[model samples]
Target chain A: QVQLVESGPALVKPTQTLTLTCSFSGFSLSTSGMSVSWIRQPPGKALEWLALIDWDDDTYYSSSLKTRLTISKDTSKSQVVLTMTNMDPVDTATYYCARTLRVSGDYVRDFDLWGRGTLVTVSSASTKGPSVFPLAPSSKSTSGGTAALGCLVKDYFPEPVTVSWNSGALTSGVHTFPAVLQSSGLYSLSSVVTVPSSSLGTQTYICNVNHKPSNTKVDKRVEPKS
Target chain B: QPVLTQPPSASGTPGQRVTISCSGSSSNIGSNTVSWYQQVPGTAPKLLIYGNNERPSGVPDRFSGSKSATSASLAISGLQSEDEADYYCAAWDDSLNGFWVFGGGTKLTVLGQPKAAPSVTLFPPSSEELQANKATLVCLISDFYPGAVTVAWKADSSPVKAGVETTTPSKQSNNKYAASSYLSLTPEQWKSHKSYSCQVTHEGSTVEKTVAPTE
Candidate 1:
């Protein structure tokens, strides 16, 4: 029964920085096939992913927090750490930790179990509403199938969401400016175009997002029998 | 977009119903999407779920995902002999400036009786309960089939802070073998908190789960 124990109050001021630690003891620090992450939530609401860290000292954090959040480990003491900065009440919620085993290289295996949650608090007012991001289609006109791909952004409440199409391929191609996507509110954003299921054998299509340019974009592909 | 956090692989045997669970908080599933990905030994991740529960155009109905307020899941029903490969769940969070996290991966082993092993030991002996952004933790396993075995720690059942790894095993008792793995960290990592997870791979299948903690 491996577990994580975080620390902190459930509420804090808008300006106060919140710091919590996931303490480990029974597990050995010489661990190599494991990783760590931080997630958040508003009071009486859903949760969110913050960042990722591993034994090799690598990481994948929420685009915004990637710059400010820090993760490290003590192999000698057999401990891992997660840290954050510029905290606010919006950062409050239950935090957790766990581990994974690495069988070999080239293949990222599986995630086993998780720990009991630890709740952190932020003072600034956050929303319990949905999110809103755009999607980029990666469908190819293969003579005749409903092949579409794109990212889905929720929230923005009745906001005129936009969608875009592209050609050539992600590596080298032309793109159309984002267009309005009706029937979108809190879920569903797809780009189904014409394509012969067999023509799909040609090449993979890329779905580049026009949303959050500073961050990463969503890219989905399609081909015959891949 | 809901950032994805699942392994690039997993597998299993016939006459079995293997399940690769996906974990995520409200940000992505609460408001937007919950999609699962499935790929063979050599291929791209195919979309298993879109809009949380619906399957994509060409996706096989074998993959299914269910969602609620702040959590969602993926279940592979009626596992067949050929149902061997990797599986993963995905979503994104604007709260964290769009950093996509993943659950540590899981490798499902189809044994005589499905093994649902559970170990609950406090990483750092604690006197009080758990708070957010204060500490870190880890989970590990070395007993299953290592050649095809994978393991990871997840925060809320999503893939995050994960990468390549290899390790030795601990000695268990006689016939029954056992291995160890974990996912943990300290407070500094979450002062600016977001979301994360750990997953693994083993046998011929995949499994993923998560726990979101707060301080």
Candidate 2:
């Protein structure tokens, strides 16, 4: 049995670091089977999953904010903290914190318990729209194989947005993709990149998605695959 | 997180079986094991599956499960009288990193006509019988009260060292409790000629049943 309690002012400023925590009951912080996250919800909007932190000290942040946010934990007190920086009007969205299923004997993924989102607005003046979830590759991918990196966007404009592959030495990371409602009210887009046989396990593929109209971005990665 | 879409209205007749579907992507459905849970208005969520098709220990055979890549499914066969409850599917994406993932659950409306009781013996008999050094038994006492029980072993009507292990379920009652008793006696202890009983206690009274295996 798990219950999450989140606390913070419903509002915050631009470019300043905002923080929130999740306290749990009925389970132990060191029980050895849990995953944690920080999520958010903008005014009258849907929830956006922030970052995931595990007991083993592993972490994953939403692709859109990976470069601008920091998610951490105070395991001693059974609390998870997330900090977002360089905020702008576009980064305004509700954030939530949660833990994964813990898959009995498994680790690092599958979120089940979620915290009610804590909505915050970053602003030159906080501003925003329907936030999309950026996709990340598996945390356990092998050296090289074809990996389909994907994500979810709630309010798509019409046509599908775009996701690009960054051929840097890094193997993978979350990239951002924003939409403007083309003919369809909403749609989702995923990025696919063929990892070089030699670059498979040794290199990281950076998936970058840029949201049109709004300048928001979500970048996530694939676990190096075989 | 995607907006969880649940049908505002679903109707099922008594004895009629039904299911609700949860749709999500790799972050929540694909790359993760989809699970189903049953909640009766004012109760906690009981686990129905792990990965996809595997049922958690103690779950009723009536409540079976299955799944496919990306999409997961839960089937409640032969709807029971008490089946008119809320059902939900919890999805997971391990490939994204086993963090928190979930699917909006389904609301079930059972007509309350149970098909048939599962007819079978305790599964795979206790490994203790084959292990050569322990005595154990598992029972089905679904109609009991005072949740969270402890199981122990006694020999010669006296207490013997015992240990117990239980699994977490979507709900406690349907998830019949299992108890194991460990006794360290040589083959000579078998000569005592006293029958050993495994007991189930609920609401204060005790219902004891005994079983002995042939060598």
Candidate 3:
């Protein structure tokens, strides 16, 4: 049986760094089959992955948080730490420490063991709305096979955002990378869609972005090049 | 310098004694204390030995550790089924601003348990996602023992390396284990490919499940 306890401050000021620790018993932090991760869920939102220190001691961060997150471990203390800087009101959430297992030489994305989580409230107001970029062809677009279109949404506060394409009728071949935190304390993300090349010049493609904080919607359009 | 190294696997029968070795260098094991950890399947690792040869409080007397020069060893006496787990050795390196180095981990298997094969099943993409121009094929593997298995995806009988994800085996209520593998494909690729298959290799035997777009 494994037991993990999370300890951290319940309140953080705007632009301040949030530090949390996960102290564990019945397990060692040096095991190659066991890794530690940080995940959070804001009020009335879905769970978000924050960072991971894998069995091999290599760290991976959520693209949206790579710029401001640091995950490290203290084997002697039997604990792992999560540090994130430039916090805002949107950063308020219940942060959890989880144990991720690896089997058959592969790391599983699923977390089997978890802590009860500690709630963190960042005292600050929300910032700017997201900026939507015009739809453009992705570098991966093939000449006559598949047309890949990309949309970049950046400089958003309160990370809850939604992206849709072609009036929500286009669904196939969509890949959305996680939001990445910027140095300015805002978030950025990119979504790409793939469609048959034959339909490119015949129809209009629209990228729709909705930022939930301000109830704002932005649309960008791109016509197929001749 | 060189990283700590350990054998990939070690095995023993109940009531027997087994030792797993960890080789290191002067900067680590020779100068710093060595620690050992034991990790059972589906759970976290536990500290078994610390300070080179000292067992932590509550750790069983059957587990012991020893070090010699630049090498270390963890010895398990009176091995039992419950002792079957992965073992790792760690030490702090005095070089390069100081850091902790770990062994690749040695899986210790206690023999005598009956070997069981896994049951493989294939599932097609859901109608909702299929209609949205994306498809995902799932392979469910269950009832496997020892928790060591390899999963692979094949498209039209050829192996595929893209967009495939596999989960670690999870222990079931019956003490058996289950795992899953997923293959993601564009609607176009799913339509163009005639068939996709998930193959699992366990205990020198391979079991597979195949899915076709028509199915």
Candidate 4:
């Protein structure tokens, strides 16, 4: 029944200290054998384990970020905090706080539960969202039952762009591939939405492509079966 | 961390089966039991196979699991469109001392078939089933293909959050599936005239049936 909430600045400056707090309830930090850790995902990258602090106050760091990282807990307030100094632009990613579960009778732990990640940007450029241009995405029939759509964006500044889809209520059967870097330095991404052949002319698909640094969101609609 | 590996993607079609593989080393899968999870967008990852090959109480028999030589596999037979989802495998690792390792999930796509919306109906608790004062409102969803339907109870326009129970998709003859959800209420609560609804979501559309209490 334990729950975790992560709170921190959405934006941080290079070389400045980045602090994040994970507050918990329905569990005791002192009497319980519980611990806490910090994990981050750089824009378009994999997850990086930062550090952990056990209930007895021992700490472990990932070696690469060990020197400038500080992990501590406030037992009275049921909060764990992570502070990483001398940050670089690479630190711009989503940060999450997770509750750990012992999966075996041993040291193996599983992050069975997670908090929704918070996006972080370490840019000194304008914090305003990006200028978005809507493009009528192109679709192709891959197989009798499969279809793919390419949302080409030759315009926009900055490097990272994320694309997703919404066809109304919590749509499934939709998959967005990684955005590849075009020769122009902008991202050209594609999303393939496969529905049963019967839904081709029946289900309309919407694409949401965003640039976090510029905070620009562009939504494009594709007609059913097109 | 326990090193667990899986393919990035997989594909199948209605009535066509697909299998996803999970590989690990002696520190994990070779030493411990394996479990599998299914991640549908915007929802929490649900445990599909646990304790190696055992299904959860409500999971369909069409979805199965197996393991061998530090490796494990999950197979979805008689695939329906709703079977297209992201699958992940987990096992305890004896590495870095000991911990759990999870495979980088595989996305399974079910293609080419048309979606068949479900037929939903509500049945009030029978006379013998009633606990003298409590009643169970049962919503039956049948003949649905793609197996990707959701059922919920609502009072007015807001949501009814408590006393709800839903089942995993169960296979029916002729390639269709069925499921049911229930809500428990007191006779006074049911007769209060506040109105109740069984909301079923399938194939990008939601169909709701509402009724008031009697007796």
Off by over 4 Å in 1: A43-47, A105-111, A124-226, B1-88, B91-215
Q: Per-residue lDDT tens digits of candidate 4, residues B1-215?
A: 33378898898867877999999998788888887777654334556776646665577988898999889999999988677667888775666644446687788877676668886655443333344565556565767878778888987566895867666675553446677666667776677756688899998899886755542
The top-ranked prediction according to lDDT is: 3
Q: Can you rank all candidates by TM-score, best first?
A: 4, 3, 2, 1
Regarding lDDT, does 1 or 3 come out ahead?
3
Candidate 4 TM-score, C-alpha based:
0.48
Query: Candidate 1 on A23-73: residue-level lDDT in tens?
Result: 665555346776655555333333345666676677777664566677677
The TM-score obtained by chain A of candidate 1 when compared with the true chain A: 0.45
How much RMSD separates candidate 4 from the native structure? 19.7
Candidate 1's error at A197, in angstroms?
71
Chain B TM-score in candidate 2, rounded to 2 decimals?
A: 0.44
| TM agreement with the true structure for every prediction | 0.32, 0.38, 0.43, 0.48
Q: After superposition, how far is residue A121 of candidate 3 from its true place, in Å?
A: 25
Which has the higher lDDT value, candidate number 2 or candidate number 3? 3
Cα error, residue A68 of model 1, in Å, equals 2.9
Count of clashes in candidate 3: 3
User: What is the Cα-based lDDT of residue A34 in candidate 1?
Assistant: 67
Tens digits of per-residue lDDT for model 3, A1-226? 6888888866678999999999998877687678888877665343456777865788877654678999999988988999999999899997878775545543232355678777687866455687665434433334368766656565577655678887788777765444555445666665667787777777788888887555789877755532
Q: What is the lDDT of candidate 3?
A: 0.72
Clashes of each: 164, 82, 3, 15
Q: Which parts of model 3 have CA positions greater than 4 angstroms off?
A: A1-226, B1-5, B23-32, B41-44, B51-53, B68-70, B92-101, B111-113, B145-179, B183-215
